[PDB]
Design an enzyme around this catalytic site. Structure first.
Site, short mmCIF file in Angstrom:
data_model
loop_
_atom_site.label_atom_id
_atom_site.label_comp_id
_atom_site.label_asym_id
_atom_site.label_seq_id
_atom_site.Cartn_x
_atom_site.Cartn_y
_atom_site.Cartn_z
N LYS A 171 7.12 -5.83 0.74
CA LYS A 171 6.32 -5.16 -0.27
C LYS A 171 5.41 -6.14 -1.00
O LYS A 171 4.21 -5.91 -1.13
CB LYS A 171 7.21 -4.46 -1.30
CG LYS A 171 7.74 -3.11 -0.87
CD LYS A 171 8.60 -2.56 -2.03
CE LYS A 171 9.15 -1.16 -1.75
NZ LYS A 171 8.03 -0.19 -1.54
N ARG A 200 -0.40 1.96 -3.62
CA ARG A 200 0.22 3.27 -3.51
C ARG A 200 -0.85 4.36 -3.27
O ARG A 200 -2.03 4.17 -3.63
CB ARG A 200 0.95 3.58 -4.82
CG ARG A 200 2.13 2.66 -5.12
CD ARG A 200 3.36 3.25 -4.51
NE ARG A 200 4.58 2.47 -4.77
CZ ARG A 200 5.80 2.91 -4.50
NH1 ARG A 200 5.99 4.13 -4.01
NH2 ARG A 200 6.85 2.14 -4.74
N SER A 239 8.21 1.48 2.51
CA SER A 239 8.99 2.24 1.53
C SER A 239 10.40 1.66 1.41
O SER A 239 11.08 1.42 2.42
CB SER A 239 9.05 3.71 1.94
OG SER A 239 10.13 4.39 1.32
N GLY A 240 10.84 1.47 0.17
CA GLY A 240 12.21 1.11 -0.12
C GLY A 240 13.19 2.16 0.36
O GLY A 240 14.13 1.84 1.09
N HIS A 241 12.98 3.42 -0.02
CA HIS A 241 13.83 4.50 0.47
C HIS A 241 13.96 4.46 1.99
O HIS A 241 15.07 4.55 2.52
CB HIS A 241 13.25 5.87 0.08
CG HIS A 241 13.60 6.33 -1.30
ND1 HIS A 241 13.15 5.71 -2.45
CD2 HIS A 241 14.33 7.40 -1.71
CE1 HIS A 241 13.60 6.38 -3.51
NE2 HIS A 241 14.31 7.41 -3.08
N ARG A 273 9.28 10.82 0.74
CA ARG A 273 8.33 10.05 -0.07
C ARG A 273 6.88 10.45 0.19
O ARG A 273 6.01 10.25 -0.67
CB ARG A 273 8.56 8.54 0.12
CG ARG A 273 10.04 8.08 0.05
CD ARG A 273 10.67 8.39 -1.31
NE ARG A 273 10.34 7.40 -2.33
CZ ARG A 273 10.63 7.54 -3.62
NH1 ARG A 273 11.23 8.64 -4.05
NH2 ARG A 273 10.31 6.59 -4.49
N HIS A 275 4.22 7.54 -1.16
CA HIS A 275 4.07 6.67 0.01
C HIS A 275 3.14 7.21 1.05
O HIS A 275 3.06 8.43 1.25
CB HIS A 275 5.43 6.40 0.68
CG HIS A 275 6.21 5.35 -0.04
ND1 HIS A 275 5.79 4.04 -0.11
CD2 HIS A 275 7.35 5.43 -0.76
CE1 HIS A 275 6.64 3.35 -0.83
NE2 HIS A 275 7.60 4.16 -1.23
#
Ligand SMILES: O=[P-]([O-])[O-]
Length: 576
Positions: free
Chosen positions: A350, A357, A399-401, A487, A493
């Site tokens: 990231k 974004r 994306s973190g998720h 997301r 995202h």
């Protein structure tokens, strides 16, 4: 100190009669409390790290007393390097108390107020109330632990010693520091989100109703590059995102990603929003974006893994089964270590790319035929507050998720292959679950009409109640996929932050432009058909790399599992 009234968890009460599940539950309670009171270990990567640390300590305490045959303790008691040396039990023979000592000492070390020298970061100062609220969670847990806690027992003291080793080795107290980081604005560049460009915080956290000062938050910009990894055995890297570096020429992909972002991720009422009501539910279900009484995504992934664990346990007795204790101790170590390293590498990527974004990319696009300078997202839900939905304060790609879900659910798949069913390592499983409720959609939590009152139950506070949606899933493959695309539905995202568009969307005869229905809504490949195979280039490194968070998490889980859960070699930890 008036304790935070915590709402009921949708889980059978029997789960917490297992002592491994009990201590996992305490870790999750601390997660949601710390995000309500502004305590330590907030945010996705560090909240994952806390659970990895908890479960490594539990694992090595348990497996020292009850030696396994198919694997070993993570740390060895015979290691010459003191930092990596597991304490020996020396007669200690009570696994229940060993686990209690490891869990309590680890969680106390993680969440307690730091003693002396006033260990507090300017702008990241934590209130006395926050520490006290977390202390109450720990104290209450001691009385609730199944079979009780005996602090005087040799096994309990052994567990504490195990925790001390892991805490000294792996704690990164200032890992989330943002000192010296500043955005570099421009096309594709992460910067302050336009709906939340600045926040006002108390000058003194112990005087919250007093004077305020502006603050621009940037979440953990150095963590990924500096922190000690847990069980990975290499550095992990993603392809340049469309628009950047070696993929600056991927204009058709980028432009279509903008179009899809607008249609699928916009606010409910916008004429340009083509997302369905069910897709809104898919967006919100997976959120857990640090909200009051809810916490972060690692908390939800653990709630799901608890259900998987109990659904597929080998013995009926949750309280008195060593088979079940060993099963859960091993699974949660594997899962939460994978979640930790997923946080590390997703954060590292990231902040390497600093990709903007969708809200900023759509607004700042600058081309009338593509951009919308006034666009609004559905957004990360601001649950159990009166605040407006937001953009999480860190860059987009990956994306973190998506990465956490890749790692957690691939780890579940590697662990249960052969047991629940059989599948190729990279093909759909049959790890189905039922009656799975998200706290974002539970008939209790809510979008409040006024600021959250930390002295009252959530049900006593006016707001719009979130619809209760009870879900079944066919597979861990489905969980992983839906978590990632959630997301896109929130508008937080880009499609490629999740996975290569080619791997999740339906193609057309136009390259990099994907199919839509009659209304302009994006169509997805069927879960059974999805394979995360499409690679891309990097400007700075030769070879082929995955695209987006899902395959990053998958590869991390596979590496950790293939190596039997062993520490990252000291010599490949970041040093600089
Ligand atoms: O990184 P993200 O899933 O908000």
């Amino acid at each position: 100190v008036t304790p935070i009234p915590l709402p009921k968890i949708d889980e059978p009460e029997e789960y917490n009669t297992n002592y491994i599940l009990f201590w996992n539950h305490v870790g999750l309670e601390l997660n949601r409390v710390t995000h309500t009171v502004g305590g330590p270990l907030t945010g996705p990567p560090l909240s994952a790290r806390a659970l990895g640390m908890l479960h490594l300590a539990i694992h090595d305490a348990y497996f020292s007393i009850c030696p396994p045959t198919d694997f070993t303790t993570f740390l060895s008691p015979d290691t010459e390097n003191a930092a990596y040396r597991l304490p020996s039990p020396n007669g200690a023979n009570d696994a229940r108390q060993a686990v209690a000592g490891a869990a309590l000492k680890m969680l106390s070390s993680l969440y307690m107020k730091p003693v002396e020298q006033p260990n507090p970061n300017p702008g990241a100062n934590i209130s006395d109330n926050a520490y006290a609220q977390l202390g109450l969670v720990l104290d209450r847990s001691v009385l609730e632990a199944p079979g009780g806690v005996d602090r005087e027992s040799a096994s309990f003291m052994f567990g504490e010693d195990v925790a001390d080793v892991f805490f000294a080795l792996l704690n990164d107290p200032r890992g989330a520091s943002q000192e010296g980081y500043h955005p570099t604005p421009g096309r594709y560049k992460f910067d302050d989100e336009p709906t939340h460009p600045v926040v006002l915080i108390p000058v003194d956290p112990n005087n919250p109703n007093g004077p305020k000062m502006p603050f621009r938050q940037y979440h953990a910009p150095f963590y990924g590059k500096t922190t000690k990894r847990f069980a990975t055995q290499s550095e992990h890297f993603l392809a340049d995102p469309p628009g950047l570096r070696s993929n600056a020429d991927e204009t058709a992909e980028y432009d279509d990603a903008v179009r899809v972002a607008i249609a699928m991720g916009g606010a409910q009422a916008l004429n340009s929003t083509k997302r369905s009501p069910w897709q809104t539910a898919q967006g919100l279900y997976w959120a857990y974006d640090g909200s009051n009484l809810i916490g972060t995504p690692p908390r939800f992934y653990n709630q799901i893994v608890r259900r998987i664990a109990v659904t597929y346990k080998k013995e009926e007795d949750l309280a008195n089964s060593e088979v079940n204790n060993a099963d859960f101790a091993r699974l949660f170590a594997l899962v939460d270590v994978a979640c930790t390293d997923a946080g590390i590498f997703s954060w590292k990527e990231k902040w390497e790319f600093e990709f903007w974004r969708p809200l900023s990319g759509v607004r700042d696009d600058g081309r009338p035929d593509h951009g919308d300078p006034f666009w609004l997202t559905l957004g990360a839900p601001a649950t159990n507050t009166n605040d407006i939905p937001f953009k999480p304060p860190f860059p987009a790609y990956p994306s973190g998720h998506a990465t956490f879900g890749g790692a957690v659910f691939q780890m579940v798949r590697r662990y249960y292959n052969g047991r629940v069913g059989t599948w190729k390592d990279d093909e759909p499983d049959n790890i189905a679950i039922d009656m799975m409720i998200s706290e974002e959609l539970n008939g209790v939590n809510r979008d409040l009409r006024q600021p959250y009152d930390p002295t009252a139950p959530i049900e006593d506070q006016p707001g719009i109640v979130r619809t209760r949606i009870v879900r079944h899933f066919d597979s861990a493959w489905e969980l992983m996929f839906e978590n990632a695309i959630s997301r896109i539905f929130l508008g937080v995202h880009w499609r490629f932050d999740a996975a290569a568009a080619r791997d999740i969307l339906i193609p057309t005869t136009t390259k990099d432009v994907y199919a839509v229905d009659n209304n302009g809504a994006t169509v997805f490949q069927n879960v059974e058909d999805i394979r995360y195979t499409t690679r891309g280039t990097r400007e700075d490194r030769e070879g082929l790399f995955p695209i987006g968070g899902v395959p990053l998490g998958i590869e991390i889980a596979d590496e950790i599992f293939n190596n039997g859960l062993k520490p990252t070699p000291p010599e490949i930890q970041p040093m600089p």
